[PDB]
Amino acid sequence: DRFELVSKYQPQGDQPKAIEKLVKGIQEGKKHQTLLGATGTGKTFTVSNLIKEVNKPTLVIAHNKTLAGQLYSEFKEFFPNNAVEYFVSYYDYYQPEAYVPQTDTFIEKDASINDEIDKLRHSATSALFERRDVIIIASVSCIYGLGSPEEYREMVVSLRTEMEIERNELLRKLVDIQYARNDIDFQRGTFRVRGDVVEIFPASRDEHCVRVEFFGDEIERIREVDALTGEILGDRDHVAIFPASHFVTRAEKMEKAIQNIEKELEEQLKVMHENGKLLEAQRLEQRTRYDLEMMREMGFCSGIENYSRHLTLRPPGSTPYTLLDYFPDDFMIVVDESHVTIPQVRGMFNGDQARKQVLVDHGFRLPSALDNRPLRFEEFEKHMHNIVYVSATPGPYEIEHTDEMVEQIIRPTGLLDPLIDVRPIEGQIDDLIGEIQARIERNERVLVTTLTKKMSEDLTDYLKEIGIKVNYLHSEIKTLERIEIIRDLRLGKYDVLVGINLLREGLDIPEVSLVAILDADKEGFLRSERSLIQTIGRAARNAEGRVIMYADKITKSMEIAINETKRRREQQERFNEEHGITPKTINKKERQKVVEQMEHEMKEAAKALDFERAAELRDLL
Amino acid sequence: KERQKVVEQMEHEMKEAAKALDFERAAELRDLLLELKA
Lengths: 621, 38
Ligand SMILES: Nc1ncnc2c1ncn2[C@@H]1O[C@H](COP(=O)(O)OP(=O)(O)O)[C@@H](O)[C@H]1O
Prior knowledge:
The structure holds 2 chains of a larger assembly. Chain A is an alpha/beta fold.
């Protein structure tokens, strides 16, 4: 079951040494290790190599789904013959259930499920039971509730050729595991029957189904077929069909769980009446007994997840089953951007618990709803066999638990850490204009970080008044719109981006030759050692990259950041000299509303692939 | 998987041409894609 790493690359720079150390670290049974890779060193190639050498099922955790998608695309290319999988929340958008006591307003759960994401989730969990050569790229969705892997495993329908089994008995088993008969619209999670042929569309597929051909009570053949075409893709001697749902509640357990929910309700109502929580008792009882009628009628009610722990018949406070449980005991976790991802993982339970206690306090939910929850960080720790944190700036968790850092500081094409200049706060804006103007003449772009909304808007406005092409990265710009703006910077539609936080997803672009840091000496979050080094990093994608920090004094964070930058650049230039390498970059209000409408139109015409209409609109613009 | 790989790759490249505003390339790619689907 080996990983086969496919790439146009060979390990370069100090990648071989980083790989060596990390592999030896796992051989030494080191639970925690940290890969201290400076930005642009190819840390994802390093991890690919680690994954190949250690050869365990591996979980890669990422802090946003844009980066998770980005890792997934890359790992599929790296391991085309192994099972690279994607595990993210299937919600296209998610408004959780919430209550605002201040305004006495309840927020209903609002959300739509993405069919492709649910598919990839099913593909992920079934793979863990089919083979060892599995890499999953996941969000913190990996610490959220899933049915019992033992049950999921156990509920598989196994079929093999020459097997005895009745056609209709197969139908019954498939229903029992949440497949639906649909002869007319045959989709995933669905079976269709034509005489002696059953076609099952696995929940893990939207592309290929399993055709099972009977002769009497015996399977003659099993074929992977193209669902739409009927074109045979291959014969199988064996197929495992996994449940179409990650939480199936058979009719027997549901009856009992309804027993237990009623009793819990009966006890909570008692306690609330004694404490004169009359409103909250009325509300809770209406809601719960309605939920309970629906379960008795349909075996389903909306927001049924609030009852997950009851439906399992497990005692209160029980750790949820998560994806972590689907993995063998001997698996590896890689935590991408660990300084961000680790605090996020810890923050999920507490955010969840806070939101749900205001619902239990005010009678919208039973206390058992809190058992429908992500893992506690102490629970996530229990799943750590070998964990490798990946970060240019490791957090205090990683630092504490790692005996020695594995450093990786050398870039494939020899690109250096930028030159840093410290310049006074006085004459700040004017000094910067000059540096921007000079970058404009050179067909290079600029990133600039301000501490405030106020300075960002003032400087953006002033730049615009001057004839400079600029965009303010406002904080409430979503990453989808962010990426559009960044694409436009790359194109030279803008020459400068001004933002408070430049550490937001996707801001590493080769065309940027200058990063300017206003108020570098104000510490806080924005001017911490971590923020400074990451911000410096944005200038390291360009062979003439440079940072300017405006500051009247050198704070502790400036010192560590400037020191580390200068130290790496030194070793990097030594490597380059010693290896014969030359660093090379890898690669008016009325007008305003008209442009925003035609742009939307141009973008719509592009999604529709009416590229001619999108051209007409670009030329209009 | 190899056909589907190239098709799926062509699509990426078409969306990318479009994001560069290189709608001329994107159309060239769309038209090739339609022939291959046929
Ligand atoms: N051994 C290698 N040879 C050539 N190119 C590489 C190698 N390793 C990584 N790269 C490429 O060099 C660039 C810099 O890597 P990147 O992934 O941005 O680093 P990081 O993940 O640390 O920010 C990327 O385009 C990456 O795919």
